[PDB]
Amino acid sequence: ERMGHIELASPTAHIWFLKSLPSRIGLLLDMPLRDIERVLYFESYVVIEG
Amino acid sequence: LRPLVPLDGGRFATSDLNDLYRRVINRNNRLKRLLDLAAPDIIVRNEKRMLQEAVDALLDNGRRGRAITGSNKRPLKSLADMIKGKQGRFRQNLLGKRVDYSGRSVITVGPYLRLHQCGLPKKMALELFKPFIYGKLELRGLATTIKAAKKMVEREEAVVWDILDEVIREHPVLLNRAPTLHRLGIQAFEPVLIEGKAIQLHPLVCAAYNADFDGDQMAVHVPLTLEAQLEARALMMSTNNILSPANGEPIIVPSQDVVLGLYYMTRDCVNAKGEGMVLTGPKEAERLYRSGLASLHARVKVRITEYEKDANGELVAKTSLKDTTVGRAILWMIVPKGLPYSIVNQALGKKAISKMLNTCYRILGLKPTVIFADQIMYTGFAYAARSGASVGIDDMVIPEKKHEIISEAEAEVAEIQEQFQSGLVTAGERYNKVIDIWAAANDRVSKAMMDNLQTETVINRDGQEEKQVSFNSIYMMADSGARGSAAQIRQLAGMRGLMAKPDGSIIETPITANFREGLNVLQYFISTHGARKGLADTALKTAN
Amino acid sequence: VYSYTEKKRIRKDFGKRPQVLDVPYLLSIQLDSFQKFIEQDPEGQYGLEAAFRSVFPIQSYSGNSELQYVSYRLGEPVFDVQECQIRGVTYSAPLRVKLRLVIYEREAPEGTVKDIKEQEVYMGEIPLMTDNGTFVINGTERVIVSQLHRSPGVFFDSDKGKTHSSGKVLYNARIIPYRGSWLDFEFDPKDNLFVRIDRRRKLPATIILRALNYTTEQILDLFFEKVIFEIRDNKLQMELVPERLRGETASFDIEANGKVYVEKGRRITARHIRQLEKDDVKLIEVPVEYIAGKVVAKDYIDESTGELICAANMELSLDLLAKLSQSGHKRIETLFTNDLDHGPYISETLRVDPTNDRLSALVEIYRMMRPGEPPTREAAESLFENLFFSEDRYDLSAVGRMKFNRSLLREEIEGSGILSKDDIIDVMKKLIDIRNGKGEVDDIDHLGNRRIRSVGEMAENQFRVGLVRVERAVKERLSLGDLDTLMPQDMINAKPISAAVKEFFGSSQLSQFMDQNNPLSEITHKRRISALGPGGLTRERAGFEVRDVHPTHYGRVCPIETPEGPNIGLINSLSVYAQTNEYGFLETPYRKVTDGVVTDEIHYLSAIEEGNYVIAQANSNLDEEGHFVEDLVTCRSKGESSLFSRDQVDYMDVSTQQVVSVGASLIPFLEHDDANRALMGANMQRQAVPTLRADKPLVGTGMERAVAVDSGVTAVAKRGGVVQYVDASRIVIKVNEDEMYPGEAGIDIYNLTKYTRSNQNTCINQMPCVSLGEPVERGDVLADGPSTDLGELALGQNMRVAFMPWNGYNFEDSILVSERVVQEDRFTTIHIQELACVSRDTKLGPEEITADIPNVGEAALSKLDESGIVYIGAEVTGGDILVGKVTPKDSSLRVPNGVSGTVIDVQVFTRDGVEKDKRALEIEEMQLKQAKKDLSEELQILEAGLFSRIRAVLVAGGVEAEKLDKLPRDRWLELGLTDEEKQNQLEQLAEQYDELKHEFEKKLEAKRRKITQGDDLAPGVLKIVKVYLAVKRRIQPGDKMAGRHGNKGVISKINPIEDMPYDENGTPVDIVLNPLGVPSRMNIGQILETHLGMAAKGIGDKINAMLKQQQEVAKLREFIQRAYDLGADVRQKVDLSTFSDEEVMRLAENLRKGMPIATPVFDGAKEAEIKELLKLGDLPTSGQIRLYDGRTGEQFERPVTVGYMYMLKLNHLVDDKMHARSTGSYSLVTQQPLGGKAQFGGQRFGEMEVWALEAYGAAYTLQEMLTVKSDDVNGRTKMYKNIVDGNHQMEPGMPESFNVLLKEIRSLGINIELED
DNA sequence: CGTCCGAAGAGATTCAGAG
DNA sequence: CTCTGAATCTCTTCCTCGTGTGGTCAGGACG
RNA sequence: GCAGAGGUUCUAGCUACACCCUCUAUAAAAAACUAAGGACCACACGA
C-alpha cells in the first residue's frame, strides 16, 4: 500500500505525454515534435528568454 | 507488487520492473556524483541522457525506438506494458477474474435425466460443496472442530455421503461451455449425483450450448448466496429458457435420434400385419403392438378423444373414429389434452416436431411444454432403439442410368471439343459449354438417384403391387431431417459434382465417382483442394 | 517364397496392381542429412570441412602470422545411448581439430616462416544422432523437424489489387540471398522504379545505377533504344525502321526517295506495315512537328565554345532543336518511346532522381542506411561495397546462384556469391520487360521455389556462426599478441563455439520434444516439414494462399495430413515416396515410357521438370508387356488433368499410394471417405496410447510392416542365425558360420528395454516373440515393442461393432461399451510418472536424505528404508512419504494428491566427492553385481564360441579330442594342433587369451569405474533421487475412443453384458455406435471396413472350428488355400504346397483369431470381392444380421450392421481432466485461483461469461463471482465463516486487483483517486 | 557481509497544382 | 499561389478456454 | 491473553481476519475456535 519516491537530479520528461498521438507538450508549445525530441535528448538548443 | 521471490534453487531473482528501477537509481546516483564532482559538461550531459533513457524505459519501454533487454534478448516489461494489452491488469485480472468453487470435466449424454437437472460426479461434488458439508457436520454434531470435520471428509465415511445428499437437494449449479457467445451458454441446472467422472448433460439442451460429445469440456460453478440460489432458479434454469433472445423461435428442438424414432413411429405401410382392425383406444394400440399381433405402422381405425379449448378455459371432449396408424395412436398418449389430433397424424419429421412443441407452448402454458418435451425425447429414444435403423453398403443405391448419362455427357464434351478444333467456337465458349453440359449431367444423375431411392419400394397390397414411400435407412435419415440433407445423399450415390480449383475456377472434368465406389487419385486431390480451403477458412472465421 | 517372419502370419493381400519400387527407409531424410554433416568430405563441399575451409584463412592484418586448418577428427562418445538416457547427459562426440600456426618473419610477405605449430585443439562438442534419428540432449529425446523456406534467388511478383485502389499493377522484384540484405526493386504508381534495400524507405532506382559508376549516358543507352536524327536540308530527315513503326499510328506522311507510302495522321495498317518492309527504306522524310515532343538520349555541347546546349534525357523543344541545328550537331540521338511497348519508366525515375554522380549516390545511400551519422566518402564507399559485393557479408549459395541464373534465363550454372553489376542491371531489365508486358510473374507457392532445410544445413549454419565469432576473437588476439610464444590452443577457446551448437540443439523453435506416443507418432514427427522458425512465416503472418494445396504437391507433400487448428497447412507431412534433391528441392519417382512400353527404370523428377513432361496415372491397365491396353490414357500435363494417347505419354506413376503420407496410407478404404474425415482421422492415429495386449489389425492397408520395422520400437536382427537363450529381458542369438566374423565372434546379444518412462508418460516394453531353435534371418523382427504384434503395427484393438441407436445412449457422438471390454482388460493402459527430490547445499550446512524426518508417524516412515528411500514394490498412494530429505532447521518429497500406483524402480544420482548412502550403495551394489554378472556371462558365451572354435578346429587335425579335453581346452598350446587356415587363427586367439583375460579384467575395472564414479551434477546440489510411479488406468465413462476413419466420441455408459444386444447365435456385441454420423459426415469407409472385418472374423472362426475338433492337416491346407486365392487377380498368389506340415499348423494357430486382410489405399477391394469373401464363410452376403435385444428379448426389425472395426483408445483420458477446488493458495495479485490442475486452481470466468451473465438479470451472482469468490481478503474469510455457520450472506468489499491497478497507475505519474 | 562493479485500417502526416 | 484532393508515414490490433511439455534471467571480483 | 504469562491439541497457532481458557511469576489442569511462495518464452494437442 505504501510507496516511495526517487529524487531525480535533473528534470526528466514523461514519455507518455511527449510521444503520443497528439504530442501533448508539442501541441502546448506549438513546436514540431522533432525539435522537442532533439532538445530533450541533449542534441540541440532552444533559447528560452531570447 | 513487484515480487522478486521465485525461490527456485535459491535464485530469488525474477523482477523485470526491479531491474529497470535499479538502472534508473544507478544512473541518478552517478549523475549526482558527477554533478558534485564538477565533471566536464559533456560527461554530465551524457549521464543526463542516460538518466532520461532509463526513465523512458521505466515508464514505457519500446516507445522511443529501442528496447532495454538482455534476458535471452527479450524486451523488458515496463509499467505501461502491465496495464495495456491482453495481459495487463485491465483485461486479464479485472474483467475476467478466475473464480473459486469451480470444476471442469468432459460431457456425457445420460438420457435418463429430466430437463431441469444434470449429472455431477460424486468426487467432484464432494470438493465443490466442502464448506456446506463442514457446516452441516458441525450442526448435526458429527464433528466438533473444523479439523475433525476435515478428517471425516477426507476419510469419505458413509455419513459424509448422506450429508452431501442433503446439501445438494436444491442447489443449482451453472454449467458453462468455453465459447459462450450468446446468453444461453451458461445455464443453471439442479445436480443429480452419479458415480462416473463426467458431468452428464440433458440431450435436449445440447443444442443451445452448441454442446458436442466428441470430448467437449464444460465448467461447473456453484452459486453460494441465497440471492444467487434464487436467481439461478428464477432467471437461469433450463426450464425458463425456452425461446431464444434474438429470434422468437424455440431453443429446445429434438435433433437427431428422437426425430428418427418419431419418424419411424409415425409412418404407414400399404400392407402390414394388423390392418383394418377397429381399435378401442390408444391403450389397446399399445397392448396390440407390445404383444406382437400388429405392427407399429399399419393403417387401422381407432377412436380417439380430442380435447379442444375453444371455450374460454374449458376443455371440450370430442370422441370420434379417426383413421390413423397404430404408431400414431400410441404417440397420442404423450400429447397433452389441449392440442388437437392433426398434429400427430402426419409423417412427423423435424419441422413437424418443432411446430408441435411451439403449438403446445402457444395453446398451453410453459409448465406442460417441459413435460411434453421430456416425454417426446423418451418416446423417440425408445422407438428409435426398437427400430434398429442401421446403415449398410446395400442401402446406398446407385442409379442404374448413371453409366448412360456419363457416356452421353462425354459424347457432348467430345462434340464441343470437335467444334473448338474446327474454330467454330472460342476457348472461353468451349469452357462454358463444357461446364454447362456437365452441370446438366449432374442434375440428371441426382434426379435419377432420388427417383430410385424415394419411392423404390413396391409392396403387395392384398393383390396388385402398390408403390410406397421407401423404407431405405439413408432415405429415412434424410427425409425426416435427423442428420443429412439431399446434397449429402447425392454425394453418396450420385456423382460428386464439379469441384473447384483453389483460385475459384471450376475444373472442366468433374468427379464422376461417388463415395460408395472408388475415388481416383486425381479426384481425391481435387476434393482435397476444397476440403483444405474450407478448414483454413473456418480456422480464422472463429477469431474474426 | 517368404521369410520365417512372413511364414507365421501371412497377410491376405487384395492389391491388384504390381509394384516396381519398394517403400524406402522412412527415416532417410534425417539420417542422410546428418550424415552429410560429420562425414569426412575430401573435396570440402557440404559438411564440416566446407565450413572450416570457408572461415579459416586466419591471417592477421599485416601481422605476418597465419593459422591454417588441415584436418578434423570426431572423437568417441564417453557414454552410449543407454547411459546418456539414464544419467541425463548429452550424447556428444568431442571435436578434435588439428591446426597449424606459422610465424612469418617480421614484415616478410615474400619470405617464409620461422617455424610451424602443428598441434591439435579441442573445439567444442557436437551432439551425435542415434541410429533411429533422435538426439539425446539432456537425457530426453529431441527431433529436429525439417524446414521449408523460400529458396534464395530472384523472384518477380505482381502485388496487384489493394494498392492505389485503382487496379494499377505495382510490379516488384526481390533478390533474396542466403545471407545478406534483400535487394528489392519496386514500381511506383506513377511508373517510377524505386529500389528498396532491406525493406527500408524508398529510394529511386537510378541511385543504385549511379552508385555503380554509371553515368547518365550509360544508363540511357542501357535501358532504352535510340532514334537517330541527321541534319539535312530536307526538313531534318531521319533514319527509320518498319519494325519500330508497328504498334502505333503514324502522325506524318511517311515518304522516301520521292515515294509516299503512308500519309499524315494515318494509322499504319497491317498491309501498310508489310509494304513498308517490302520497300526497305532507311531514311524517311519527317517534319518538325514529329520531333517536337521527343526526349533526347545524350548530351550535346556546342562546338563554338563547349558549353552544353542540351542535357541528356531532356525534352527537345523547338528552340532547342534550332539552337543545336545552328551549332552544327549533325547527329541527333533521341531515345525511342513506344508508349504501348516500351514505356518511359527509366526516364521518369531519372526525373525523380535527386543525385548526379557516384559521390552523391553513395552519400544518399549512407544517409538512408545510417541516419544521424555524418556522410563520409570513405565510410559510404565501404558500407555500399560490403553490402552488395563482399564475400564476407553477401553470400548467394550455389542453390541461389542456380535459381538466379535460371530465372534470368542465363546458360551457366556455377557463378559466384556476390551480386555483380550485370546481375543488377539484368534484374532491372527483366522487371522493366515484365512491366512492358513480355514475361510473367513467378508463383511463390510453387514447390519448385521452396526448398527443404534439414538438420545438416541448420547445424552447419550455426557452426559457421560460432566459427566466425571465434575468428573475430582470434583475429584481434593474433595481432597484438606476442609471436612464437603461444600455441594454437591458447588463442582458441571452446565455449564461444560450443554455446551456439548447444543452444541450437537444446532450445530452438525446431528442436521439438519427441512424442513417443506410438511407433507411428515417432515416424511422423521425424519426417514432418514446418514453414515456421528462423526465416519462415509466423502463424499470424501466414495468409490463406500459403495454407492451400498447390497442384504440384502431387507425390511431394501429403495433401491430407495437416494439423487442424491455427497452423493448418503450415506444417505438412512428407509423402511416402518423396526424396530430397541434391540442391534441396523435393522429388518424386516416376517410370519412364520410351515409345509404348513402360520401362522399369525409375527417374526421380523435380517439381519444375514435371511440368513439360506428360505423366500418366497409376490406375492404367497394362498388358503384361508394357503397353497400355486403353488407347486413351488419362494424364496430367501442366496442372490440368486431360486425356492423351499412348503415343504422347512419356512418364507414369510408380505406385498408387505415392500421394499420401505414412499416416494417411495406413487408413484402409481411404478411397471412400471425404477429404475432411480422412484429415481428422490421420491426426488421430498418432495419439493412440499403447494398450496392454497388442492386437493385430484385422483389416489393414499393407504398410503396417514398414512403420514398425523402420521405427526403432522393435529390435531387428543384425545377423542371421539360431536363437540360443531367449528370456523375458535378453535374447542371445548364435550367428551362422558364414555371417560370423573370423575372430572374436559367435554370439549377438540383444538387450530388451523393459518398462521405462516415455516422453508422454507411457510404457515402452519389448516382449520376445521367438523361441529356442527358430531360425532367425537377417531383417527378422525378434522382439515387438509398444503397439506391435509379430512385427506389425497394432495401435488398437478390433471389437465387435453394431451400428444402431440404443435408448439414446449413443447420441451425437457417444459410444456404448459392453462390460466384456473392461473385463478382459482390452484397453487398460500402463502409465508411468517420475517424481524427483533434489538435496542441495543450504545455509547453516547441507540437507541430508536420512529417514530422520521430525514430527512424522511410524506408519509414514514404514515405507522408507533405513537410509530413507521407499522400497521398490511398495504400493504408495496420495500423501505418503517417498524420500527423507531433512533440511537444517522436513522437506521430504510426498506423492502428489491424486497420484497412485506402485514403485517400479528408484535411481540415486550422487555427485563426485560425496559418500554414497547405504541404499545407493545397495542399487550400485546390485548394478555392479549385475554389471559384473554381464561381463562374466559375456566371457562365458564368448568361450562357448571361442573354446568351441578352439574345438571345432581341434577335432580336425588328427589330435585326439579326449587328449585335448583332458588338459585345459582354452590353453591347448601344449598339444600342437595340426597347422591349417584356422589353426593359425586359433593359436593367435589362444595367445590373445593368455593376455585377453588380463585385458578383459582391465576392461571390467574400466566398466565398473564408470558405474562407481559420481555423475556431474548442477552446481550446489549433493544428490538427487528419482522415483517412478506406475498406474494401470482402465476404461471409464468419458475416455475418448475413436476409430481410424475419423469417427470419434467419448464412452457414455459401460453397459452390462446381459443387456447388450445379442445376435441369433448368442454372442453379444461390444460397441453400439450411432448410425446417424455416417450419412452427413461422409466417412463411408467405416462401413466397408466393418463388412471386411466381419468376413475376416468369419474365416478365422471357421479355421478355429476346424482346429477345435482334431482334423487332418489336408483339410486345413485346402481351406486355407481356398481363402488365400478368392480370384480377382490378387497380387500375392500365396502357395501352401511349398509349406511344411508344422508350418501349415503354425499358420492355422496364428490365424485362428481372424485372417488379416491387406487393402492398399487407392487400389483396394471392390464390393463384389468382399461379397465373395463373406460367402466363403457362412455369414449373410448383405452384411446385416437379425440382432435381438438384451433387456426385453424381442427381435429388432430391419436387421442391423454387425462387424469388426479397429477401435483405438485416444490418450485424452478423463482421469486427467476432472479438477474441482473449493479453495487454494492465492496469487501475487491475491486472486485465489492460480489456475491449472497441477496447482489447485479455478476455471477462469472470462469476459464472455461475464457478458452472458449480464445478459440475464444476473447481478448478485456477478458480485459474488467477482469480489467474494476471487480476491477479497476481508470477504473470503467472512463468507467462509458465514457458510460454515449457516447463513449464506456476503460482504462486497473491493477487489484487490483494482487496488493493484490504482497503485500501478499512480506509479506512472498519473494521480487517480476514488472520490467521495 | 555487504559493496561496488501480413493485412487492414486509422491516425498522423506532408505535398500539391489549378482556377 | 495557397491549401484541393492526393499521396506519405508511422501506429495499433488481430477468439477462448482447457491439457500440458521443455527452457528460463540481472553482475564477478573487492576492499 | 481480563492485563501480564503459559496452554491441551487437530502443521503452525496473543492477529491471518483471528479466538478462547486457566493461572499470578511460570509453567500446567481443559473443552470450543482458522487456512501460507507462483516472474517471463518457445513447442505440441483437444472442442
Ligand SMILES: NCc1c[nH]c2nc(N)[nH]c(=O)c12
Ligand atoms: N492461537 C491460540 C492458541 C495457541 N495454543 C492454544 N491452545 C489452546 N488450548 N487454545 C488456544 O486458543 C491456543
Ligand SMILES: [Mg+2]
Ligand atoms: Mg464437440
